[PDB]
Each structure stands twice: as structure tokens, then as C-alpha cells.
Design a protein around this ligand. Structure first.
Ligand code: URA
Ligand code: SF4
Length: 194
């Protein structure tokens, strides 16, 4: 049987791709197992690696602030993870073989949580989830800021791509766009399906 607990244990000791050799801590993700909103980023950065926790550096602090101020939620009420769960070396993005190796953990996490909404933060997570959906992916610029319905198992999941929070740290305009995207996510979260 599968569980978020089992996945967490596996990730923490995982050596299924070459990223394990560099890490201090793998980062399985954290949050409410019955979260209505699931956030998926790219991969851990430096502070995430040090702490074993997703989105805790500057970009993460911005994410937390938007979740709190715009969605009206604490981190413990949502679920937050990444498509790749170890920090790639040298500030680089995950290789495709690393996404291929690690993404079954995310698949398993989604299978268990079955959130109402998945917010895909940035191009890597958006491209990955679009591939599972069978939704055409052009670029994050072209696809962000609206919802995509993912018929999955017995339910529908609303997928909402946004820019990654890191992109909003030093760009006032991009930040405003991300905030507006989170306002739209709030409306989707509080509105009953009809
Ligand atoms: O957890 C993290 C931290 C930074 N960037 C991400 O994509 N995820
Ligand atoms: S990135 Fe994923 S697949 Fe690779 S070692 Fe870490 S947990 Fe395992």
C-alpha cells in the first residue's frame, strides 16, 4: 500500500538518480494530506537542501506570503513539493533523466492527495504536469494565468500554471502578475464546482 509517509521515507534515502551524491537532505515535500491546493515547484535550492523542506529560501518566503495574504492559508493547510526532490549541483536545472527518475514520487503524491487544484510554479513543473494531462505545452509565458481541467481517476483536478516565485523576487511587474494569478487561484478554491 502507498502513503505520503512511505514516499517520504523512500525519498529521504533515495539514490535513484545522480543527484543524491550532492545533497545534504532530500526534500519530499510537506503539508496536509487532504490539501485542496497542491503547489509544485522545480527542485530544491540551497536552503531547501540544508533544511530538508521545500520553499524556505527567499523565493519560498515570498510563496508563503502569497499563500497567506492572498489565498488566506497557512502552509500546513496546503501541500508543497517539487517535480525533482534533490538540489541539482551548480545552480542548474534538473536533467531530463533526473525528472524521469524522480517524477514517479510526485505522481504517487498526487494519487494520494487528489487535490482540487494543482498550482504549477514555473516551467518545469508546468511542462511535467501538462505531459501527464496530455495538454499541449508551448511556454510558461503562453500558458500561465488560467486554469486547465485535468480529468484524473474519479475526479477533476484544476491545474493552474504560474511564474515561479523566484522570478518575482526582483521584478515588481512580474510579482504583480503572480499576485493576480494567486487571486484567481483563490477564486477557484472558494467557488463550488457547478
Ligand atoms: O522548493 C523549492 C525551492 C526553490 N525553488 C523550487 O522550485 N522549489
Ligand atoms: S532527485 Fe529524486 S530520484 Fe534523484 S536521488 Fe533525489 S529523490 Fe531520488
Amino acid at each position: 500500500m502507498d502513503s505520503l509517509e512511505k514516499i517520504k521515507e523512500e525519498v529521504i534515502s533515495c539514490k535513484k538518480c545522480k543527484l543524491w551524491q550532492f545533497r545534504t537532505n532530500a526534500v519530499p515535500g510537506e503539508g496536509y494530506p487532504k490539501a485542496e491546493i497542491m503547489f509544485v515547484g522545480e527542485a530544491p535550492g540551497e536552503n531547501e537542501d540544508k533544511e530538508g523542506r521545500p520553499f524556505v529560501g527567499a523565493a519560498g518566503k515570498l510563496l508563503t506570503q502569497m499563500i497567506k495574504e492572498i489565498l488566506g492559508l497557512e502552509r500546513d493547510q496546503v501541500f508543497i513539493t517539487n517535480v525533482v526532490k534533490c538540489r541539482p549541483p551548480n545552480n542548474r536545472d534538473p536533467e531530463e533523466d533526473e525528472i524521469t527518475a524522480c517524477s514517479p514520487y510526485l505522481d504517487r503524491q498526487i494519487d494520494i492527495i487528489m487535490p482540487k487544484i494543482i498550482v504549477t510554479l514555473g516551467r518545469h513543473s508546468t511542462k511535467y504536469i501538462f505531459s501527464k494531462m496530455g495538454e499541449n505545452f508551448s511556454s510558461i509565458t503562453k500558458v500561465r494565468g488560467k486554469s486547465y481541467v485535468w480529468k484524473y481517476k474519479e475526479k477533476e483536478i484544476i491545474v493552474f500554471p504560474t511564474y515561479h516565485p523566484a522570478a518575482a523576487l526582483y521584478n515588481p511587474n512580474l510579482r504583480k502578475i503572480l499576485e493576480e494569478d494567486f487571486k484567481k487561484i483563490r477564486e477557484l478554491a472558494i467557488t463550488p464546482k457547478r
